[PDB]
Amino acid sequence: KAHVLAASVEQATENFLEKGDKIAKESQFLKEELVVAVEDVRKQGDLMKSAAGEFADDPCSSVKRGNMVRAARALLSAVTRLLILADMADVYKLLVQLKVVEDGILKLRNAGNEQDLGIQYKALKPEVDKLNIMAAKRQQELKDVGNRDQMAAARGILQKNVPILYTASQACLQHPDVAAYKANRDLIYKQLQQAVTGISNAAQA
């Protein structure tokens, strides 16, 4: 009946590989690297299948038991390497979207007339929304309450200030000769950049 236990390791290995194969195929980041990592999980997984099957067939053999334990170690090491790369891939995707928002904020800031300001605002709003969802999912995975709070705070500043930068820039365009509006626009822009760097650093902590 020991095979009942070996079957479960096999079932779990296949289940894991199925998920890994899909992430490696669909990833826009670390694609080749994820593929190599999954290939090894598969390689070590098949070695474990053989070792576990031998152990289950001859439980008292200190040798077969030893081969199984070592094959188990190699398998779990490969699983760990895949998890690490999968996690990095998630971080890379978030950092790319953060850059999209950072570039969009600069464009909103510097629109040359109200017509373009409205367009750059419509261009930025959706990217902010997406970034937030992604950063929130990253926040729930952060283990340090410190980094988790920094992340929460940065997301809030970003969402609260995008609408305000639009209003600030609008005032600058409507009143070109008033220096105070430009100073306000720069102040809001600064708050936003600090949120951007906050998200960037918290995401990698």
Added chain:
Amino acid sequence: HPTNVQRLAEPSQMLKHAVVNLINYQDDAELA
């Protein structure tokens, strides 16, 4: 749209548990 971490989380856990259970296997009746 779950992250890669979420998609691999439970599967990885099930594999780790199954490996532990196989290693925990001992049955002295097998000796005979």
